[PDB]
Write a protein that binds this ligand. Structure first.
Ligand SMILES: NC(=O)c1ccc[n+]([C@@H]2O[C@H](COP(=O)([O-])OP(=O)(O)OC[C@H]3O[C@@H](n4cnc5c(N)ncnc54)[C@H](O)[C@@H]3O)[C@@H](O)[C@H]2O)c1
Ligand SMILES: NC(=O)c1ccc[n+]([C@@H]2O[C@H](COP(=O)([O-])OP(=O)(O)OC[C@H]3O[C@@H](n4cnc5c(N)ncnc54)[C@H](O)[C@@H]3O)[C@@H](O)[C@H]2O)c1
Ligand SMILES: O=c1ccn([C@@H]2O[C@H](COP(=O)(O)OP(=O)(O)O[C@H]3O[C@H](CO)[C@@H](O)[C@H](O)[C@H]3O)[C@@H](O)[C@H]2O)c(=O)[nH]1
Ligand SMILES: O=c1ccn([C@@H]2O[C@H](COP(=O)(O)OP(=O)(O)O[C@H]3O[C@H](CO)[C@@H](O)[C@H](O)[C@H]3O)[C@@H](O)[C@H]2O)c(=O)[nH]1
Ligand code: NA
Ligand code: NA
Ligand code: NA
Ligand code: NA
Lengths: 338, 338
């Protein structure tokens, strides 16, 4: 199929593009480069074994989106583009609602214009809000996210749902991601955050590579087995694969197809640290700090639906997530070149 | 004060502009004329007794908004502009989210740019969602509106709230309107819907003026005293006054000030019909029809907070709402001239 991958040069998109090309699809990447570098492009093609077309531009540019869509005869759109720094979203809400809410709106408006009706959206478990019932299941009603980032994702799912209702021939997948980690097994592609990483895995990796002193473990008094926060970590390669399958199986299948994408099991902060210490061959330095504002104690996905419906399930393990991350971090300490 | 009134030439905005000018404020109206006519301008000035500046343009045009804001040294913004046809919103969701959500976002983004930090938003009781507890009170958590229109209003309240949190010097009023009806006592200004009116009052008025056959009463089996739907009708002049007071008292008062604007009492469909039959001097023709999709049986506002805090309460009665509407309808059967 002909697919437009917005945010295609970012973390999850890059890996998804590789898997897409491996499957022989024709890939067009659209990215504004606010959080990625052109240097990843050659890696995508090399690892993907096929050339992906790249377009530098913004999802907020409806006219350009429409043109791309038509120019490349796109059949389906995978939308990863947007802003995702939780804390920053609290400090700069407008930028979040603009890039995520208006950004998606401009893109689907362009799709309508170009007669494109297959869409895949990067959603998040954050949409469940403060749900005491865990694991989270697609049948649960959504809750109220506590950050502008979380809210923006829920708002987009609602807009997409209403759109599908009004244009019933559309096929829209709402893919609720849990906690993406890991890197391509080659060690030549991975997450390349700029500045202080907000997520656990990259933070740990930077401590291990010798850039940072100690990992601050936010809270050790949660009601969990070890007192640290529990999450559902999912290898970016499994996530990528899920996207290819969802795209292939849902294209032209009318409806709003919601699926949680996670491993279906929880791991604590210590579990992650331990796996990384093991991967890197040295104990990762860490200390206990106060709870981070807005953090829930524990949650993970119920991924039965995706298994059942798409025959998709994770295959990489926690150790692999850690190992692949270290291999990338270690082979490319400065990330992608400028 | 210097105030920009978006949607200023529409129903509620026109009446609010008249009251604002009467109070000696400097008014700049911004409207795209998608649902109003330039012909109202002269009426505003005449009844307001002062000239309001008019700018034809769209809230979605951030660059233009910023310019206006600066050019006119605006101190506060009253935002009435947007789309409000409930049923149409279901059929055309994107236009609703674009005009309302992105539309407001562009406007407050322009405000940030121009250093304007006092805002008044036209919200709605729809934000309470399906709340069994009536009357509705500002302290109730919001629910989930069932139309793209309702959702768009709730989304904007959330974006505004987050913005205020990030820029704490802002004063933002979330004015939750109930069911606006009535017309300026002069009979020379009022609601001028194009095509089939969606609301009860104008529909009744058109039946009475001889344009329509019979009023279809949507449902007669609700759990209400007479079986018909119950709402909180509020005279547009009282609404207008509430806006002037809110603007005057809340300007430069940091916070998100939420107030329900209603009469605090409920009236059934039959109650309204009866009042109009009385006003127009002939029995209004009507029949019973099935319930209209998405309609709640009964709700009204708890307006104690606005009374307490702003010393504001309604003063016009149901009969006046009916009479003023008939006077306008009757004096200007073709509405505002082309
Ligand atoms: N990584 C996670 O932990 C996490 C979990 C839940 C959801 N998500 C979502 O998945 C998507 C991918 O996340 P990621 O980790 O790959 O992040 P990322 O930052 O690596 O990828 C986002 C890409 O979007 C591009 N972009 C941003 N705004 C744009 C705009 N307006 N126009 C065009 N391009 C734009 C960026 O330059 C970047 O390459 C995002 O929507 C994110 O919110 C990720
Ligand atoms: N009338 C009601 O029953 C009701 C109840 C709840 C909330 N509201 C809200 O109050 C506000 C005023 O409603 P109203 O009855 O006066 O409606 P209205 O249609 O008479 O007024 C809206 C005005 O906005 C202008 N407009 C629309 N989109 C615009 C855009 N993108 N840029 C610039 N101008 C634009 C229209 O041309 C119109 O003059 C709206 O936000 C509406 O949703 C009204
Ligand atoms: O330096 C750090 C970073 C994280 N943590 C803890 O590690 C866990 C994971 O934190 P983090 O990696 O920041 O991810 P989450 O806060 O769970 O959020 C991720 O996963 C969500 C869905 O589960 C998405 O909404 C977000 O976009 C994505 O950042 C939590 O218990 C954190 O308290 C630490 O203790 N120290
Ligand atoms: O032809 C008609 C029109 C209305 N009704 C009934 O009259 C009542 C009022 O209906 P309507 O005038 O359409 O207003 P609402 O549906 O209550 O909605 C108005 O008030 C809401 C807040 O209370 C706002 O969200 C909306 O923008 C605004 O249109 C309801 O019981 C309707 O079923 C009829 O029976 N026949
Ligand atoms: Na802040
Ligand atoms: Na670098
Ligand atoms: Na429809
Ligand atoms: Na007319």
């Amino acid at each position: 199929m002909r697919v437009l991958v917005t945010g295609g040069s970012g973390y999850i998109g890059s890996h998804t593009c590789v898997q897409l090309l491996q499957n022989g699809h024709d890939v067009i990447i659209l990215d504004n480069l606010c959080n990625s570098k052109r240097s990843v492009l050659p890696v995508i093609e090399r690892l993907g074994g096929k050339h992906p077309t790249f377009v530098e531009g913004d999802i907020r540019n409806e006219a350009l989106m429409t043109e791309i869509l038509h120019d490349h005869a796109i059949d389906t759109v995978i939308h990863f583009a947007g802003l995702k720094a939780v804390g920053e979203s609290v400090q700069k809400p407008l930028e979040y609602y603009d890039n995520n809410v208006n950004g998606t709106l401009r893109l689907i408006s362009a799709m309508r214009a170009a007669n494109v009706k297959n869409f895949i959206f990067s959603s998040s478990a954050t949409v469940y809000g403060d749900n005491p019932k865990i694991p989270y299941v697609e049948s649960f009603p959504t809750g109220t996210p506590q950050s502008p980032y979380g809210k923006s994702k829920l708002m987009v799912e609602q807009i997409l749902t209403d759109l599908q209702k009004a244009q019933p021939d559309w096929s829209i997948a709402l893919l609720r991601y849990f906690n993406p980690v890991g890197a391509h097994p080659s060690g030549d592609m991975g997450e390349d955050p700029q500045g202080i990483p907000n997520n656990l895995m990259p933070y740990i990796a930077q401590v291990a590579v010798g850039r940072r002193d100690s990992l601050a473990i936010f809270g050790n008094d949660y009601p969990t087995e070890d007192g640290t926060g529990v999450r559902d970590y999912i290898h970016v390669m499994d996530l990528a694969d899920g996207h290819v399958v969802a795209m292939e199986k849902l294209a032209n299948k009318p409806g709003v197809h919601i699926y949680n994408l996670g491993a279906g099991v929880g791991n604590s902060v210590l579990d992650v640290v331990n796996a990384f210490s093991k991967a890197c061959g040295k104990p990762v330095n860490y200390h206990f700090a106060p709870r981070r504002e807005g953090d829930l104690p524990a949650y993970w996905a119920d991924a039965s639906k995706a298994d059942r419906e798409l025959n998709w399930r994770v295959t990489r393990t926690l150790d692999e997530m850690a190992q692949d991350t270290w291999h990338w971090q270690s082979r490319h300490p400065q990330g992608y070149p400028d």
